[PDB]
Amino acid sequence: YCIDIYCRSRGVVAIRDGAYSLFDNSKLVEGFYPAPGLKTFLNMFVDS
Amino acid sequence: SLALVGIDSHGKLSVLRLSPSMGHPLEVGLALRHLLFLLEYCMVTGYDWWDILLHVQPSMVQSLVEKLHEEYTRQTAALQQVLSTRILAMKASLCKLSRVCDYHTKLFLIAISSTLKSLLRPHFLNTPDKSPGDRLTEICTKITDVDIDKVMINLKTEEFVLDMNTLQALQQLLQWVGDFVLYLLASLPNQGSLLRPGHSFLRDGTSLGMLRELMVVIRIWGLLKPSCLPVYTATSDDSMSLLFRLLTKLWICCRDEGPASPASDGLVSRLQPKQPLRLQFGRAPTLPGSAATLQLDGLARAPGLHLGACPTEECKACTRCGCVTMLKSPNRTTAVKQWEQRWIKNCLAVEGRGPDAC
Amino acid sequence: DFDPVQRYKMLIPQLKESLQTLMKVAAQNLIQNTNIDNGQKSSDGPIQRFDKCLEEFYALCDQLELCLRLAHECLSQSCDSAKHSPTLVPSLPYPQYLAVIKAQISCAKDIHTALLDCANKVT
Amino acid sequence: QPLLDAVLANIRSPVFNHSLYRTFVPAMTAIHGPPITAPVVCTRKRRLEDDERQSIPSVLQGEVARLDPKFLVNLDPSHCSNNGTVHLICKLDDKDLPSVPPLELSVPADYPAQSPLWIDRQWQYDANPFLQSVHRCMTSRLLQLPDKHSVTALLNTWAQSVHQACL
C-alpha cells in the first residue's frame, strides 16, 4: 500500500496513488497489493 | 509620434524620450479619435508603429480596439480578406503592453494555427474530381457529430497523398495542433481557477470547426501512413476517436451562443493517462514604461516552429524572433522547405526578427 | 516464509535483467526516432513506450531497498537487545522481564526529567 | 556490458540531436515533477571590465611590503610607468656599512629578471678597494642562484654579502 504524498509547490503539497504507473485500469505494477480501500475519501475529509 | 532622440550637443550621450502630448489642453474623445485615425493610417500603409508612448493607459485601449475591430469588419468593405493578418498583428501589438496578456497569447496561437491551416488546405497534390479538392474538403463542417470513420470515407479518402517523402510534418509540426487541442480540452472544465477565461476560452466556434477539419485530415493521413502524431503518453497503439468526439461535442455546444465552463463538463472532467504539457506559448518581453520613469543601459539589461524553439542547450545559430517563432536559421532539415520558404522574409510583425549568439 | 537476504540474493538477477531490457528498449526507441526524423520509412516496429520498464525498474529498486531496510532494522534491534538485556526467556520469568523493562523505562524517563529540569534551571 | 545504447547514442553525433527531448522529457516529467529548475533571479554576466587602472602589479608590492624594516623602498624618476612598473632604491640600514643602492627594475611575473644592473658600477665601485671586493663577492655569489628573484632572493643575497663583507 505505497502512499505517494509529497510537496512540489512553494506553499502547498500533493497526494496521489503510487501504484498505477501511468495505468489507470489498463495494467498494474505487478507487485504488492495496490489500491487499498478508498484513500481519496480519507484525503478529501481532511482536504479543508 | 513625438518621441525624439537625445543626441544633442552634450558629448557622447545616449538617446532619450519626450512626452508625445500634442498641445497643452486635454481632449480625451478627440485624442482617442486621432489615435484610431493614425493607427488605421499605419495599418493601410503597412508601416511600423511606435505610438506606444502616445496612447493613453490600456483602459480605453479595450474600447479602442473593439471599436476599431467593429469599424474594420463593417466598413472593410472587402479588403478584410487581405487585412486580417495586419489587423490581428495590430491587435496583438496594442494589447501586449498594459493584465490582458491572456488574450495576447490567445491571439498569437490563433494567428499561427490559422496561418498553418490556410497553408495546409490547398497544399494537396490530389487528383481532379467533380469539384476542387479544397472546396470539397471545406464542406466537412456539414457532417455529423460522432463516428468520423463514416464521414471520412463518405467525403473522400484516396486523393490525399502527395508524395512518399512527406513523413516530416507529423514528428515536427503536427504535434503542435495535437498538444494544442489537448491543452484546450484539459483546461476547459476548470472555470473555478482564479481567472474567468483561465488561460483561454476560444468560444468562437469557427476556429473549433477549423481545428476539427485539421484533425480529420491528419486522421486520413494516419490512415494513409501509420506514423501520425499520437497522444505520446499511453495507449497509442484509439484515443483520437474520443478526442474528436469530445471536441465536436464542445463545438456543437458552443457554436450558436452555447454554454461554457453541465453534464458535458462533468464527462470531460475525466482525464485519461494521456495529458501532455510543456507547450511553447511563444512571446517576447517589452518596454513597460508606464507613466514616470524606466531607464535602461546599453548592456546588462535590467529585469522587468514546433521543432523545439525552446531547448535546454544551444546547438545552432539560434535565430531569434519577435512574435512566437524563435527557430533555427538554416532550419537543419531536408524537405520542410515549404515553411522555410513562407518564412524567408519578415515573419508576422517580424520587426524584432533578430539573431543572438550563445 | 521467505527470508529477506535470500530474497535479495534471488532478486538481484531480476534487477540486472530488467536494467538490461530497459537499455535495450531505450536503444530501440532511439534508433526508431533516429531513422524516422531523417531517414525513411524503415523502423515500423511498435516496441514498449519505455515508461513501463523504467517504472518497473524503480519499483523493484524500491522493494529491494525496503527489504534491506527491514532486515537492517531487525538485526539492529536483535543486536541492541542482546547487548543490553540478559538471557531470560522461560533464568528469569517473563514477569521479571516485564518488571525490569518497566524499571528501565522509568529510569530513562527520570533521566529525561532531570535533564529537562537542568535545561530549565539553565534558562 | 550495456554497449548498444552507448554506440547508438554516439551515432547521432551531428547537429540534428533534438528528438532526445520527445524521447526522454515525457518520462522525466512523469517520474520527476520539479518546478524548481532555475526560478531564482539569475543572469549570466561573464565579464564587464577587468584591469588594474590604479597601481602596479599587486603581487610584487604585496610581497615586498612584508620584508624587514632594515630596508627602505622608494621610487626614482618614473621611467618604468607601464611595463617595468618598478624602479626601486634600497638602502640597507643595519649594523654594517652602507653602500650604493640598486636599480630594481623587474619584468613580468615569470621573473627571469636581474633587476639591478649597476649603472654606476665602474666609478662608484672603484672608489674604494673594500667595497670593490664586496661587489666582486656579490657578483660571484649571484651566478650560483638558479632563477633568482629580485623581490626576495637578490636583495637577501646582497644583504648577506654586505654583512659578510666584514670577513
Curated annotation (Swiss-Prot), chain A:
Primary gene name: MED14
Superkingdom of this protein's organism = Eukaryota
- Record the organism: Homo sapiens
Which family does the record assign? Belongs to the Mediator complex subunit 14 family.
- Relative to the complete UniProt sequence, the shown stretch is 922 to 969 of 1454
Function statement: Component of the Mediator complex, a coactivator involved in the regulated transcription of nearly all RNA polymerase II-dependent genes. Mediator functions as a bridge to convey information from gene-specific regulatory proteins to the basal RNA polymerase II transcription machinery. Mediator is recruited to promoters by direct interactions with regulatory proteins and serves as a scaffold for the assembly of a functional preinitiation complex with RNA polymerase II and the general transcription factors.
Tissue expression remark: Ubiquitous.
* Protein localization: Nucleus
Q: How does it assemble?
A: Interacts with GATA1. Component of the Mediator complex, which is composed of MED1, MED4, MED6, MED7, MED8, MED9, MED10, MED11, MED12, MED13, MED13L, MED14, MED15, MED16, MED17, MED18, MED19, MED20, MED21, MED22, MED23, MED24, MED25, MED26, MED27, MED29, MED30, MED31, CCNC, CDK8 and CDC2L6/CDK11. The MED12, MED13, CCNC and CDK8 subunits form a distinct module termed the CDK8 module. Mediator containing the CDK8 module is less active than Mediator lacking this module in supporting transcriptional activation.
What protein name applies here? Answer: Mediator of RNA polymerase II transcription subunit 14
Swiss-Prot record, chain B:
Subcellular compartments? Nucleus
What processes in GO biological process is this protein linked to?
positive regulation of DNA-templated transcription; positive regulation of transcription elongation by RNA polymerase II; positive regulation of transcription initiation by RNA polymerase II; regulation of transcription by RNA polymerase II; RNA polymerase II preinitiation complex assembly; transcription by RNA polymerase II
Classify the main location: nucleus
Q: Which GO terms describe its cellular component?
A: core mediator complex; mediator complex; membrane; nucleoplasm; nucleus
Write out the ranges of the repeats annotated as WD: 22-56
Q: Which family does it belong to?
A: Belongs to the Mediator complex subunit 16 family.
What job does the chain carry out?
A: Component of the Mediator complex, a coactivator involved in the regulated transcription of nearly all RNA polymerase II-dependent genes. Mediator functions as a bridge to convey information from gene-specific regulatory proteins to the basal RNA polymerase II transcription machinery. Mediator is recruited to promoters by direct interactions with regulatory proteins and serves as a scaffold for the assembly of a functional preinitiation complex with RNA polymerase II and the general transcription factors.
**Name of the protein in its database record:** Mediator of RNA polymerase II transcription subunit 16
Organism for this UniProt entry: Homo sapiens (Human)
Lineage, top ranks? Eukaryota, Metazoa, Chordata, Craniata, Vertebrata
UniProtKB/Swiss-Prot annotation, chain C:
Biological process annotations from GO: positive regulation of transcription elongation by RNA polymerase II; positive regulation of transcription initiation by RNA polymerase II; regulation of transcription by RNA polymerase II; RNA polymerase II preinitiation complex assembly
For this UniProt entry, the molecular function terms from Gene Ontology, in alphabetical order, are: transcription coregulator activity
Q: In which tissues is it expressed?
A: Widely expressed in embryo and adult.
Where is this protein found? Nucleus
**GO CC, any one term:** core mediator complex
**Major site of localization recorded for this protein:** nucleus
Q: For this UniProt record, give its keywords in alphabetical order, as a comma-separated list.
A: Acetylation, Activator, Nucleus, Transcription, Transcription regulation
The question of whether Transcription is a record keyword is answered with yes
Indicate the family of this protein: Belongs to the Mediator complex subunit 29 family.
Q: Per its database record, what is this protein's job? A: Component of the Mediator complex, a coactivator involved in the regulated transcription of nearly all RNA polymerase II-dependent genes. Mediator functions as a bridge to convey information from gene-specific regulatory proteins to the basal RNA polymerase II transcription machinery. Mediator is recruited to promoters by direct interactions with regulatory proteins and serves as a scaffold for the assembly of a functional preinitiation complex with RNA polymerase II and the general transcription factors.
Q: How is this protein named in the record?
A: Mediator of RNA polymerase II transcription subunit 29
**Protein source organism:** Homo sapiens
Q: Which residues of the full protein are shown?
A: 53 to 186 of 200
From Swiss-Prot, chain D:
Q: Which residues of the full protein are shown?
A: 619 to 785 of 788
Q: What does this protein do?
A: Component of the Mediator complex, a coactivator involved in the regulated transcription of nearly all RNA polymerase II-dependent genes. Mediator functions as a bridge to convey information from gene-specific regulatory proteins to the basal RNA polymerase II transcription machinery. Mediator is recruited to promoters by direct interactions with regulatory proteins and serves as a scaffold for the assembly of a functional preinitiation complex with RNA polymerase II and the general transcription factors. Required for cholesterol-dependent gene regulation.
Give the induction text. By 12-O-tetradecanoylphorbol-13-acetate (TPA).
Please outline how this chain is modified post-translation.
Answer: Ubiquitinated by TRIM11, leading to proteasomal degradation.
- State the name under which the record lists this protein: Mediator of RNA polymerase II transcription subunit 15
Q: Which family does it belong to?
A: Belongs to the Mediator complex subunit 15 family.
* UniProt-annotated location(s): Cytoplasm; Nucleus
In what tissue types does this protein appear? Expressed in all tissues examined, including heart, brain, lung, spleen, thymus, pancreas, blood leukocyte and placenta. However, the level of expression varied, with highest expression in the placenta and peripheral blood and lowest in the pancreas and kidney.
